[PDB]
Amino acid sequence: MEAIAKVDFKATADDELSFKRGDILKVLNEESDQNWYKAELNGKDGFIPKNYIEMK
């Protein structure tokens, strides 16, 4: 699927995906765990909180 960033994720570690509120976060593989989705911004990829995006 794909979902709209509701709050901005400001990552410290270069593995957790950093993104801004508004961005189109397209999901690659959430079929792993509900907590942290493996997704694609546009330019780069990483882990995204369920809470931070408009998943539903």
């Binding site: 509701k6 957790e16 907590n35 942290w36 909180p49 809470n51 931070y52």
Partner: peptide
């Protein structure tokens, strides 16, 4: 209440 960040998991 702020939007929470889940634990990454070992």
């Amino acid at each position: 209440v702020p939007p929470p960040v889940p634990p990454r998991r070992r």
